[PDB]
Design a protein around this ligand. Structure first.
Ligand SMILES: Nc1ncnc2c1ncn2[C@@H]1O[C@H](COP(=O)(O)OP(=O)(O)NP(=O)(O)O)[C@@H](O)[C@H]1O
Ligand SMILES: Nc1ncnc2c1ncn2[C@@H]1O[C@H](COP(=O)(O)OP(=O)(O)NP(=O)(O)O)[C@@H](O)[C@H]1O
Ligand SMILES: Nc1ncnc2c1ncn2[C@@H]1O[C@H](COP(=O)(O)OP(=O)(O)NP(=O)(O)O)[C@@H](O)[C@H]1O
Ligand SMILES: Nc1ncnc2c1ncn2[C@@H]1O[C@H](COP(=O)(O)OP(=O)(O)NP(=O)(O)O)[C@@H](O)[C@H]1O
Ligand SMILES: Nc1ncnc2c1ncn2[C@@H]1O[C@H](COP(=O)(O)OP(=O)(O)NP(=O)(O)O)[C@@H](O)[C@H]1O
Lengths: 318, 318, 318, 318, 318
């Protein structure tokens, strides 16, 4: 099979069609500790070994390595993460072939051409050899790359025309990727990638707030707080023992407001967009401010019900 | 081949006869950005390099260089534009020979003789060396020039007589060129060229109106508005998000009315014309006001169905 | 060669015998604009330079200089006109010698002798130096003058007798020249020259009528109207766009009738004429009124088929 | 007030008597660009709006509209020009009444009577509505016309007699107006107007010479060169950067010599003048050649110290 | 005090006269990171808080925000920058009143009048409330604006005359501002502002070159390279560890040559300038090419010894 992995910093997204026309979407959060897991026998398992150090999954605790740093797309951790995600697919273990991502800024340069060097460093990373203990790993044979902007506009761009342009706003954990594509993928006017502007901004405050609230925890738990920002009762079941939900919520809310400003300022680098779309899990978080700031009328704004998956789906339906 | 390029400021017009008696008319809008295009592979392409800077096509966005300035007929951009136009001809890439234009005022002087200096500066411009990346460019060998007035009257002038005169009104993007030719090209009484009076007058207001309407765009898009001035529904599909079609249409209409006055005033420099013709894409825009102002009876007024092409056709059928 | 130029105000008439006994008659209308002609290469040409100003031919348009003023026989324009006429002869360019005209009043004075002063001013005018651009002009060496009356009667006067007299009426564009010659050129009784009575009278009304009819034009075009006064259809092909042929024809007809009166009044200054002849292009216009007013019987009235040329032929066949 | 405006093509001349017996002469050069002026606040101002287009003053640069064309006496520009001139008078803004000019040829026709049609078209032009921005314009109520020949001879004609005639030569920018008036305004023998023979002849060569000398400029600057033709040092302060003062001066001198010829030829249409006067700013330029050509003795030749103003003064002191 | 801040994109320039007739010039580079500075106590300090986010100075490292984007004249950063600059003046902290800049294109519009809207948005920006921690900030009371072209010509324009024109070329980091002012500030013929043509062109290539040379750095460091382009030894002390000075210098030199072309092309929009001046820090970089291209003689070309300060000085000495 050719199988699609959108390897994001925080979540691996898979698209893959079992020959029965069965196209499947499978997501896997990345949260890895640099040591093995301790067993009590009932499929408690998934300890991986690669180039000295070893790893195993941990969703909940600190010293799961933080992956918001830029160079995640050449990390050894990345290889671990992707293997682990595909090992929980429900696929027949085998050799297979894949397509993966690069961030917008990685492919390109001063004269807006493919950065073959960085593209190939990427391909080479998935050659690294890795062992899971009691069990065989899938083998990853052929690798190719796509950028992280275009394909999420795919369907919408089709029924657009030839003289108009769709602004695709991709906000991920690490990177804000913006592209303007004129009227189908007939043309791509302008791209922009800002690897310092991600959802990380608030997560990496709220981590510190949770530590103040005596809940020193994983990045994943912190994101779980951000996802359920609206229910104070839910947050009671996660913030360890306090009336100081109050310290955390306000610190979270302040830093949330301060994300918007810098993201919107970045948008005013582009103009002449006829249609505007917002994809990525972070779309949920900024959607209304964007829609309102760009004065687009309802029919020209498309924001989907599974924003998190738009990109890998697009990669597939090319 | 000898191939005919009417190189207008805004549109390159080509006439060229494949030896099978096949004479072809091909037009190409000029809209170029001073940087390369960004690829996704499916003949996405056409990045040109000449004397330091580089260029690529963009129909839609600002910072495509505005070519309404006078000196376009010695611009490096011009060379780019003409090469690009011929690269989309469907011709066998090769060495070839061409004829091109000069504006009426460029050929001539105080004692109404050829301005060999300006004629030769023109020829020399098409010697400039240029590279397109993955592909070979046609080579332009022998160059000659014709003026931008005479040849569009050619057929009509033939079946005129010898004692009467045809007024050819050429309105282009930059230049209003008027000539009076007595009874076939047996004689040419009077010429006149006004390089400050072009269609640009309205385009360069409506550009600013579109920016007010939050549609900061290419000259080409603005011309597309002017071409479809009559359908408010069409203009809904181009004016980005507004009841303020209203601001744009009136500003456009006012500036349109104010073109006519200055063009008609210019005509009252000539007299004794028996026959009147109007050529160029701009003919469409002023035709009725001229016809009515000059009190010519129907049989003496000739305005064609492809006004935009009259000149290059004339160049050819000499 | 000695070549004959009847230099009339409006038309240069040439007579010249190629040594093969080949006597040729060639006429050239004078209509000159004080600036050079504009080329498209196909023998488009004939720009002359003399004593500062320059000239070129224009048959059709105003600001061709009007030559009905008296002093035409010392004008610099005259030199231009005569050179131009001989340059279209089909002669081998060279040095040559010529005879030319003077009006009746110019040769003579109070005691009816040659006016050597005016005769010599005339000769000196054809010494003026003149350049045509790409080409050599004929050189005019020896010059002599004849008066504008006698020689047109030449053949008829021969077979007349010795006791009877022939009235020669020369009506030109500027001048009415009348002479009575008794019985061959054995004697010349009486001359009379009226330089204010020419065909100009009607031409210079009809010019203004044509301007009323929005056909502001050359003197030549106006004469072309006068020549084809009889065909309303012809005049439709020249009068620019009107039911107001009506304004022009009546104004022309009125002024035509008013010529006759003053010319006939002038004739009643002479008496005792046995034979009457009318020469010049204007003869056509007044012939019947004269014939009828002078009650001459048919056999004594001679009006030729090429009245325009009678004088230069006479100059030659002396 | 009844206020006198000699509206010449190039300069508006005003005469006007503040009720304190204060008669004032005020002149204003016409040089107008078809767009508004850009402010820095210190009475930087004078932007006028009339019938679509707008205007403001510019003395120095090209695309100030050239007003040497004939139809200036029905131009909308004319109205602008006259308003502007009167706005710099130092008059109390108000309703007022005026007398203005027409060229000699405009008043008259084939039967030498007032051309009421053209006289009234003139009157109607000054009804046009015009706005200056921050400020009120004078209102022009009652309008009458005078011809451009007679009144400049006024005083001199008074102390002439009744049997002799004064030739008034008016040379303006566009028009050569000549009149012969017998012995006071007791009679006017003959008029003549040549609207193609003005000072423009040299100005419109020297403009092109200045462009050759890389000094592409206003008509006004060119006239400023003509006015200071005698000081090479002055012309150093205006001709932008060159030893090629040499190219300009000779081209100017040649075209100057070639004016004289055609103007003198025009004079030989008149005769029997006892007294000769030369008025207009152009008088300065041709005075000596005329005086010498007409062999008038000193006491019969009157050429004034403010030739430019003779006409408007005459209009007033009728 | 009224104190003069020329707020340029890259450098704040101050002029201010301590009542002792003491006029002072003080410049401050803008380079700000969106987080606070870390102390070791010895006046290590200058952390500012405004509308959520905070800022502090950093000259040396990336993620100091790049201010070459257009909208810098309404940025919150701008307010920070200006406060910071004035906090290092050596002034008594207080309420004070200021004048500041706008770019040429910001003041004006289609009908060349003040753009009150943009002028007032500017004034309002300096109302924003800001806190520096341990210390009081100056309070900015009254604000007015001047354009970025005129005042740098001030002294020179005074001793010019009234019929000639001075071309002031302002090249800044973001904007090329050109103005032609006729003979003192008696008149201003033509302005032009190109906000896409700044020194940024080369800086924003050389930034990327430095990253190739493993010296990923601040804009300021990159400018420091450009300033000391001539000493290879100096550049050894800044380019981190390489024989590949070679990669950087050539990339810098190429992009430098390609600035000139586009700036000179822009100049050929103006003509008739008698005097030419070049101001701004960028003047140093293009001076010779301009001087040579415009063929001005030495005495008409003025380029000062503190080009960077010409504008704020002019603002003051109005
Ligand atoms: N439904 C959601 N509600 C709230 N927060 C969410 C939601 N989905 C995702 N997030 C958060 O947003 C973060 C970044 O968005 P996401 O699109 O998942 O990044 P990614 O694709 O994994 N990485 P990348 O695009 O490479 O930066 C996630 O890690 C979560 O913390
Ligand atoms: N069919 C049309 N309807 C309306 N506007 C048109 C049409 N065709 C052209 N135009 C407009 O008229 C402008 C100038 O006419 P055009 O003849 O196309 O110029 P050109 O020959 O390419 N250039 P030039 O003659 O050098 O100024 C175009 O750029 C369009 O904006
Ligand atoms: N065949 C003709 N029919 C009608 N009108 C004619 C004809 N030939 C000439 N004319 C008119 O008569 C005018 C004067 O007669 P023409 O004899 O041609 O003058 P000329 O000899 O050239 N000049 P001149 O004798 O010096 O006044 C011409 O200019 C024509 O307008
Ligand atoms: N004192 C002068 N010395 C030299 N040239 C002058 C002088 N005064 C005027 N001129 C030139 O002569 C031109 C025409 O003369 P002028 O009398 O000023 O015209 P006008 O009366 O304003 N116009 P008009 O009579 O309608 O053609 C001016 O535009 C100047 O170029
Ligand atoms: N002396 C110098 N030598 C070389 N480069 C310089 C010099 N001074 C300034 N520059 C460069 O030129 C750039 C822009 O010129 P500068 O006049 O400083 O801009 P500004 O006035 O601060 N901003 P703006 O006019 O709004 O674009 C600076 O940021 C430097 O990179």
């Amino acid at each position: 099979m050719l199988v699609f992995i959108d390897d994001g910093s925080t979540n691996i997204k898979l698209q893959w069609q079992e020959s029965d026309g069965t196209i499947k979407q499978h997501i896997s959060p990345n949260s890895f500790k640099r040591e093995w897991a301790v067993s009590f026998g009932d499929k408690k398992v998934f300890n991986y070994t690669l180039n000295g150090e070893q790893y195993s999954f941990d969703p909940i605790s600190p010293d799961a390595v933080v992956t918001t740093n830029i160079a995640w797309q050449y990390s050894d951790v990345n290889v671990v993460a992707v293997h682990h995600a595909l090992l929980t697919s429900g696929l027949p273990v085998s050799e297979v072939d894949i397509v993966c991502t690069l961030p917008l800024t990685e492919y390109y340069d001063r004269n807006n051409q493919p950065n073959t060097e960085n593209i190939e460093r990427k391909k080479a990373n998935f050659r690294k050899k890795i062992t899971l203990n009691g069990g065989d790993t899938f083998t990853i044979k052929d690798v190719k790359v796509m950028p992280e902007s275009i394909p999420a506009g795919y369907e919408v761009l089709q029924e657009l025309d030839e003289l108009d342009s769709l602004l695709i706003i991709d906000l991920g954990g690490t990177t804000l990727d913006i592209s303007q594509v004129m009227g189908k993928l007939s043309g791509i006017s302008k791209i922009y990638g800002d690897s310092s502007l991600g959802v990380s901004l608030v997560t990496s405050a709220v981590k510190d707030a949770l530590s103040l609230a005596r809940t020193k925890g994983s990045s994943y738990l912190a994101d779980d707080i951000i996802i359920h920002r609206k229910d104070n009762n839910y947050l009671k079941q996660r913030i360890n023992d306090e009336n100081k939900i109050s310290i955390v919520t306000e610190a979270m809310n302040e830093a949330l407001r301060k994300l918007e400003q810098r993201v919107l300022n970045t948008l005013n680098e582009f103009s002449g967009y006829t249609h505007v779309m917002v994809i990525g899990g972070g779309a949920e978080l900024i959607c209304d401010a964007v829609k309102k700031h760009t004065q687009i009328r309802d029919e020209r704004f498309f924001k989907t019900n599974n924003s998190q998956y738009d990109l890998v789906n697009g990669m597939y339906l090319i």
